[PDB]
Amino acid sequence: RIDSVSQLQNVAETTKVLFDVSKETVELESEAFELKQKVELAHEAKAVLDSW
């Protein structure tokens, strides 16, 4: 039981950083979503002007 105690020693201190930095890396990419809008409109413009 000492071993199963000692595995969880510094873990909460690390998962209060895991939590924050992981959810930041999740949710700082709707930036890239609104980048994708600017990408795909220019792609449509390039497609139709290639047709021209």
């Binding site: 039981r1 969880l8 873990v11 909460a12 998962t15 895991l18 939590f19 992981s22 959810k23």
Partner: protein, 85 residues
Amino acid sequence: VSTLIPPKVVSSKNIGSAPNAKRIANVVHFYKSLPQGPAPAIKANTRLARYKAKYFDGDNASGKPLWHFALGIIAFGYSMEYYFH
């Protein structure tokens, strides 16, 4: 879609698991036990406790008091022989 959280749910976990019963059992088993044969009171005298200390502990444990008690009956009725026959 979100952060799942089972790293820190040991709060209300540490009642339900099976060696928790053994842990809370032997933390109670270990506190009031005398350390090293202490408080032994290895000598006591009540005009016959020395007889038990010399004869009836775990160390000596030999059948000789039986022998003594055998001689006691040899001491008893033979005198009653001198009272009777």
